[PDB]
């Protein structure tokens, strides 16, 4: 892909890893992004990094997890709840 896709936020695709990406492959592929789009590392692009890091962190925080990931891969995301 030239750039990717604009719209939804697919963790796996956000962390630059396949749907079957192994934990190690998810962390090794995320840790690089979390620090690549970090607001403390990207001063000039802090505005962008501050947003990219938000999706990247949530992605790994859900995939790297055994409970959040399973739920995500299984269902993913439901409608307004509460």
From Swiss-Prot:
Give start and end of each J domain. Answer: 8-76
Give the domain of life: Eukaryota
Q: In which tissues is it expressed?
A: Expressed in sperm (at protein level).
User: Which spans are transmembrane here?
Assistant: none
Q: What does this protein do?
A: May operate as a co-chaperone of the male germ cell- and haploid stage-specific Hsp70 proteins.
Q: What is this protein called?
A: DnaJ homolog subfamily B member 3
State start and end of the fragment within the whole protein: 1 to 69 of 145
